[PDB]
Amino acid sequence: SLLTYDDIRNTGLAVNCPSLPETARGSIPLDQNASYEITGLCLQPTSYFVKEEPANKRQEAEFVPGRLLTRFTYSLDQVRGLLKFQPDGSLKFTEKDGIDFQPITVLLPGGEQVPFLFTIKGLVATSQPGLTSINTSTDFSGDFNVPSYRGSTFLDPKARGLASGYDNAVALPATADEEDYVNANVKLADTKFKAGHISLQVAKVDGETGEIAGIFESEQPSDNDLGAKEAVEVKIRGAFYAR
Amino acid sequence: GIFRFILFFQGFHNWTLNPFHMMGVAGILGGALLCAIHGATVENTLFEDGEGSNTFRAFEPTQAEETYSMVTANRFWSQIFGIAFSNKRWLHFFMLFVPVTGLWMCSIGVVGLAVNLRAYDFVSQELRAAEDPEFETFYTKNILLNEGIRAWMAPADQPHQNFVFPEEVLPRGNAL
Amino acid sequence: EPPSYSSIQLEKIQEYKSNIVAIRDRSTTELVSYIQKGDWINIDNFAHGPFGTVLQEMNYVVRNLLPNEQPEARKLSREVFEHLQDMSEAAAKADRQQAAISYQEALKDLDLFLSKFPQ
Amino acid sequence: LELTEELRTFPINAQGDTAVLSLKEIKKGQQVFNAACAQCHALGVTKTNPDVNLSPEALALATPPRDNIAALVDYIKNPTTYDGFVEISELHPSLKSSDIFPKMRNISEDDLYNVAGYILLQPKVRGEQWGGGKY
Amino acid sequence: ELNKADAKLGTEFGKKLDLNNSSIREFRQYPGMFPTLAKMIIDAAPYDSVQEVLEIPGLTDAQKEIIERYIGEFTITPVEPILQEGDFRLNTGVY
Amino acid sequence: EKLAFYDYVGNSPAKGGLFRVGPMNKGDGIAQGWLGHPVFTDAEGRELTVRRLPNFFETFPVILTDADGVIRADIPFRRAESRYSFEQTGVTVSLYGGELNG
Amino acid sequence: MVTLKIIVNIVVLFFVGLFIFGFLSNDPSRNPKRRD
Amino acid sequence: LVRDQKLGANIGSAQGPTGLGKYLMRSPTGEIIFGGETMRFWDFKGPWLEPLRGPNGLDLNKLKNDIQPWQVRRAAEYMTHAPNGSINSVGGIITEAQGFNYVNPRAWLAASHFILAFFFLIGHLWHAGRARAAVAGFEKGIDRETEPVLAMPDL
Amino acid sequence: LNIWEQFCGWVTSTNNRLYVGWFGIVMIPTLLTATICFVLAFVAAPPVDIDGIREPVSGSLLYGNNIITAAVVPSSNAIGLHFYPIWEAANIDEWLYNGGPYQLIVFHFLIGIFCYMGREWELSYRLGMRPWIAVAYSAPVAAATAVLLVYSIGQGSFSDGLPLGISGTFNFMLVLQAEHNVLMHPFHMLGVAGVFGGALFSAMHGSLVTSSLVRETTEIESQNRGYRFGQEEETYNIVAAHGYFGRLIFQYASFNNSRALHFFLGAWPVVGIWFASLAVACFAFNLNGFNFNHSVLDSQGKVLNTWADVINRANLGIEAMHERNVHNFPLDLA
């Protein structure tokens, strides 16, 4: 195909791949201290696949296994967002403010669990190294967002067991009722580590792309388990324009 | 009025999935095949005593020779189903037996429901419905549906106790 | 047969003309830059969208305006549609100067409708 | 009760007075309620905007208040939001928008006068009715 | 481990509306707050003060007149990452 | 405590199923002590009680009502539009008599 | 799996192929009476 | 969705009641589709929202600022005119009270042929028995004397 | 003689132990694949996500559940109505998590009984029987293809189908009573009239010939022995069984001739159940049973309760509780 022409962009999987620019790493668009016609499209087809596994046999049992995506091809997010700001010296801020984000992926590693991974972009506030004119297909964007939960205050288990409404702590064992331990269902506003690079950076349509490295928390299914750690690394697929 | 008493016995007792009711579904639906499959083969093996084109002309009631084959019908069902009624009696005794012992097993279930020995609960499959949100099954999906009965229709079914409910005590799943 | 459209034009027909005049000054936009540079199916966004509301809107010249000049005003409102059939169906042609002269026809009829019928 | 006259009294105008309504105009007001006031106002709930119920707990709170049926035939003449800020005659059947919503052509003012009288007689005779309806 | 939802319901969020993690149909209970007035309230200023609103950009002086009619019917609660999260303010679970 | 033991749902012979097999002490364990009788008061008094769970239920939703029958408190299943919850009403428990008196 | 898809697609066309010219070769002449 | 736009909450950020997007999640093959229970009809290609179909699917550049007042009021009419009937005239959800009547004659004609489509498979099968026994001569039953199964060998 | 005619001459032969003949050559492979996959996935399938959001429900015997639960659980709402073979998923673990193996034992099982339809016709032409027994097997095939296929078409996805297991079925039926109301629908009510009629007429016809049996044994042995199989003389007299039932009910309303009797034995459940099969097939397009909600009323307009809204107060509850996470918008019309 030459271009995609959306009716041929049906179930053939030429569809979950946003803007891939041409091989030209020599575009320096040279912004200054002002506002922007803030950036587009921004977002990622999240896969290489790398996951840290929980130790439980203490201080050893690090050293990542791989994983298999046991579900379909909607590890993606799309077009909005990314208020860009240039602060007082370097460090070249990046604000997301209202993008389409958080798809949810399920994987299984060797070990037969199904941890629910969360690729979240909730309020990245991205720092940056020392003094850049503009991105040169070399510079490193790295910070964290805040992640959301799995139970977004209504996801019941199969005995209707949530905090936010929904039948406190027991239904059917009426005399062993208030003894179980898994009914504290509290939400959190975390911060972690994430990195995102840049590699291609075209000049005319002015879309910049390059690698990412996201390190998240896993599911807490209204607080049963502790989180696992997942190194999700893929291309960013941004698009930039400005005032 | 029977249809209320049906959905009474779903919610307040779980009259499905106790085993004494489930033999009765094997009684009636097993009874409904054995009159359907026996109604077929006597109209599939017939014996050319008429010369007209409908079959039940010139069948005498005072006729000693038997109007269906049973030799071709046994040869039919030994091949298709693999098992076949190899004598013409106990084909009729089985058609007596299969819905009568269906209702008798169904009759001794509701006497357990009379003193409401329901067997709605499994002794297993509930403690890790309590401890474990990762344990996800149809039975615990089904047992919350019966809670959808017992707090929704019970103020309107029985106004004897004057049950009145303030509309956030009722189990609502979501936006519905 | 009613000459006096006191509230009949001033609430209805001067909002009938006002909504498609508002698409009209906008219309030198991304849509001309779609047929300038390189966006095939966002023209079919526009023809069934912002020009989908240029026509379903421009439909009740029957239901509000002057029934003697109604049958001559149907085909004025039909030629603006039927030229814009050539706009969305030259997107499968993949050659955007059959659609460009189709868009210049929408200068000849939309504002000619907007010059006409102040009644 | 027999549906007597003095339970069918309700204030028909702004804040000062009422009127008595006879029996047969309610039943064609019921008939036009099941024709045009119908697909988005079954049981008083509003299926497209789910918390704009026709309960008089909530019909009083939309300003200026929608209990006066001369105001309520004005609010089908000129529909609005709860504050009277913008018209929603894009999005609502009206007589201002009869060219948009074609069902409002075969109707009159007095054919709206009884369906305004119908719609608040229904919570006068039931509590659950013209309410959330979950219970 | 107070399950983080009913504890917020005790501190005046169950009593009155709160402008920080209040539902949109809580504003329906007062005459004159729904959609075109509570849109600027719930998106912009859940900050720290019962008197900081009436000074948000986006409303007129006629729009703040309805605010001063029922000004003493809310207290600002501290923010919540259980109840503001999820886009829960504009579309709740009750319909 | 013998009179208190006969006023228990868990000695009424309705509950128990067909295949929940064994003694009643496999259902509750051994009865240790009464720990009194609950008396529920609001911030105002307004005394209110629980007399609920009839026999052919399994999971009765908890309601708290006054002398004539108007509900004053419950357990809110959906805490978006609660108006009769425990926390806004501020119900206290007076546990009178028994093991855990006062 | 695309290696598997053809192997399943052979055996459907084998069995339905041996059904569609199964009946095509006399199938009203093995009806144990006249013209058997 | 667009009711929400008037309210102003940002569509993309919000996670439904269950982790997924309340409004705009992604289908298994990449098309940004409507969320909720609408994942079954992610192949919907009617005349409205074809001006919301972007390159991938429902594009969020044009899902905001390009909804038209004609566009929503068709879908407002099509929401309440869903195919949901009673037997008689009752419309909408079965649980819902019969305030208004509309059977939606898509549905009311779709089942009516399926009565007749299945019944014509009954009689076709039941004529194919008599037609195959017409040339074979035992449409009136098997013979007394030359029974063909007694000629067949034992099992 | 001929090599390909050596085939057609074994497959169509009538002296095999089981008849695999021309309908059987589509049936026997595509039923054994439906047998072997179902028996394997009854015990060892992973959890499968029926509702289509995230949470995977378990239906296999190594995951702690018993016989009376735990279907091979149907496909996901995400895949909808799309054809989902085993070769479209990127691995096998993607296939089993997304409700894979149900479409292996629906699309094989349904074509495995539609060729069991014609196989019963085929042997009746392979003998001299009058072939009218496949039309009796369209009565439970349409019972097994309305709910597996046809209800899974018009309702939407393949998630709304029968979960083929014993207490997966019971979760389906309460949803169908919830979602569109099975009981107040006359085509279901014509079905149980065939079934309860077929319940009685099995124990009516089967009783009375067992009653009117002639004496050929003595007391000590079984009375089911005194005749040989395939004899020409009857084991019972129809003339004594006629006027027993003629003296129990109307004498005019008995069945004098047995070939008219056995047709009505083969009529009443068979014509009954494909109304009930056509009930779910006309339920599939959301043409539902009627509501008498708010039907009778005072001259006020105050709502009088009937049995039908007591039905609906039970039917509101399962509708407001089934699929308890997916519904974000207040109508369950999908």
Ligand code: CLA
């Ligand atoms: C596949 C579906 C299926 C099947 C086949 C059955 C089968 C059966 N169910 Mg069942 N059931 C099912 C699903 C099913 N169930 C489901 C999903 C539910 C909801 C959970 C129930 C709930 C249910 C209940 C609540 C009960 C049954 C009962 C029964 C039994 C029927 C008893 C009967 O016919 O007596 C028929 C009635 C009589 C024989 C009484 C005598 C009446 C005489 C014979 C008739 C009088 C004639 C006279 C002239 C009047 C006629 C004229 C009139 C028109 C005016 C039978 C075993 C019953 C049972 O097992 O209890 C023992 C019962 O009480 N079912």
Ligand code: CLA
């Ligand atoms: C065609 C598919 C199918 C099959 C195979 C079954 C099978 C069964 N159903 Mg069922 N059911 C079906 C469709 C089906 N149903 C439908 C469409 C509905 C309505 C929605 C129901 C509603 C229903 C109810 C309400 C109940 C059952 C019950 C039962 C069980 C005993 C009934 C019985 O004796 O049947 C009579 C038929 C025969 C005796 C002929 C022999 C057929 C046997 C029973 C099949 C065994 C099934 C097994 C999986 C086969 C394994 C073979 C192996 C080689 C793979 C049995 C497991 C009852 C139950 O739970 O009992 C345990 C019960 O209460 N079903």
Ligand code: CLA
């Ligand atoms: C009617 C007489 C009677 C009574 C009421 C009871 C009642 C009880 N016994 Mg007891 N028991 C009995 C006879 C009886 N038993 C007999 C005859 C024996 C000797 C075998 C025992 C031996 C015994 C022991 C060893 C113990 C009890 C215990 C108990 C108590 C616990 C509850 C329980 O086990 O229920 C369970 C009941 C069931 C699971 C119901 C069974 C239903 C059957 C299986 C249905 C059969 C259907 C049939 C197969 C289908 C027919 C086929 C069809 C084709 C016709 C309970 C009070 C326990 C206790 O508390 O003692 C300290 C205990 O440890 N019992």
Ligand code: CLA
């Ligand atoms: C008191 C016992 C009793 C009686 C009289 C009935 C009677 C009936 N039930 Mg019912 N039912 C019963 C118990 C009973 N049931 C129980 C215990 C349950 C389980 C809880 C059910 C569950 C049940 C369901 C789920 C349904 C029925 C339905 C029906 C009706 C049709 C059934 C049918 O055709 O049977 C088959 C038998 C025959 C056709 C033989 C003929 C019997 C008829 C009824 C007698 C005719 C008498 C005649 C008209 C009187 C005049 C005399 C004449 C000589 C002039 C019928 C009125 C169905 C319905 O809706 O229909 C309205 C239906 O859906 N019943």
Ligand SMILES: CC(C)=CCC/C(C)=C/CC/C(C)=C\CC/C(C)=C/CC/C(C)=C/CC/C(C)=C\CC/C(C)=C\CC/C(C)=C/CC/C(C)=C/CC1=CC(=O)C(C)=C(C)C1=O
């Ligand atoms: C006060 C005092 C002292 C009074 C007593 C003295 C006195 C004055 C008496 C007079 C009063 C009086 C006589 C009557 C008044 C009471 C009265 C009216 C009672 C009627 C009540 C009533 C509703 C009766 C009708 C119900 C009834 C009995 C039957 C229902 C009949 C019906 C509609 C359907 C039956 C189903 C049916 C057709 C079954 C047959 C089908 C079938 C498969 C048969 C099987 C079969 C048939 C065969 O044919 C043979 C061969 C064999 C093999 C065989 O399998």
Ligand SMILES: CC(C)=CCC/C(C)=C\CC/C(C)=C/CC/C(C)=C/CC/C(C)=C/CC/C(C)=C/CC/C(C)=C/CC/C(C)=C/CC/C(C)=C/CC1=CC(=O)C(C)=C(C)C1=O
């Ligand atoms: C991994 C795997 C395999 C999992 C499978 C597990 C699973 C999901 C399901 C299986 C579980 C299961 C079987 C549950 C059912 C349990 C249950 C209820 C059992 C019944 C037990 C019980 C006490 C029931 C009480 C009622 C009772 C006795 C019912 C019996 C039912 C029964 C045997 C019905 C017979 C049905 C049948 C085959 C009828 C056809 C008869 C037949 C072959 C006629 C042929 C024939 C006809 C003629 O006309 C003539 C002339 C001749 C000559 C002739 O021959």
Ligand SMILES: CCCCCCCCCCCCCCCC(=O)OC[C@H](CO[C@@H]1O[C@H](CS(=O)(=O)O)[C@@H](O)[C@H](O)[C@H]1O)OC(=O)CCCCCCCCCCCCCCC
């Ligand atoms: C206004 C109401 C709605 C109108 C629309 C519907 C109209 C329906 C009209 C039907 C016309 C045909 C009826 C007879 C069919 C027939 O050939 O029977 C032939 C046999 C034999 O009759 C035999 O008939 C012989 C006479 S002769 O040979 O046919 O000439 C003779 O031997 C003797 O009389 C007898 O043994 O009739 C019977 O067996 C008696 C049973 C009653 C008639 C058959 C009904 C079939 C079962 C009921 C189905 C109900 C459906 C729902 C079930 C849950």
Ligand SMILES: CCCCCCCCCCCCCCCC(=O)OC[C@H](COP(=O)(O)OC[C@@H](O)CO)OC(=O)CCCCCCCCCCCCCCC
């Ligand atoms: C695809 C083609 C092949 C089909 C494969 C499946 C065929 C299975 C046939 C049933 C086997 C024989 C059973 C009766 C054993 C038997 O020998 O029957 C014999 C009996 C005939 O007996 P006779 O006429 O020989 O009796 C002579 C008298 O003297 C009596 O003693 O047939 C029947 O009664 C049929 C009715 C019961 C049939 C019950 C069917 C049960 C189905 C399976 C249910 C359990 C499954 C459990 C799964 C978890």
Ligand code: HEM
């Ligand atoms: C002629 C018939 C109708 C009448 C009399 C009518 C009446 C009303 C009234 C009186 C209100 C305001 C209620 C209040 O303030 O509490 C209202 C609101 C509303 N009606 Fe209707 N209505 C009609 C038809 C419809 C139809 C067909 C729809 C569906 C398209 C609809 C959708 C709405 C909506 C969406 C609102 C809420 C406006 C908002 O979102 O703010 N109405 N209607």
Ligand code: OEX
């Ligand atoms: O999910 Mn299965 O299901 Ca028979 O409905 Mn519609 O969607 Mn739900 O509903 Mn009520």
Ligand SMILES: [Ca+2]
């Ligand atoms: Ca009108």
Ligand SMILES: [Ca+2]
């Ligand atoms: Ca609150």
Ligand SMILES: [Cl-]
């Ligand atoms: Cl559910």
Ligand SMILES: [Cl-]
């Ligand atoms: Cl929804």
Ligand SMILES: [Fe+2]
């Ligand atoms: Fe017989």
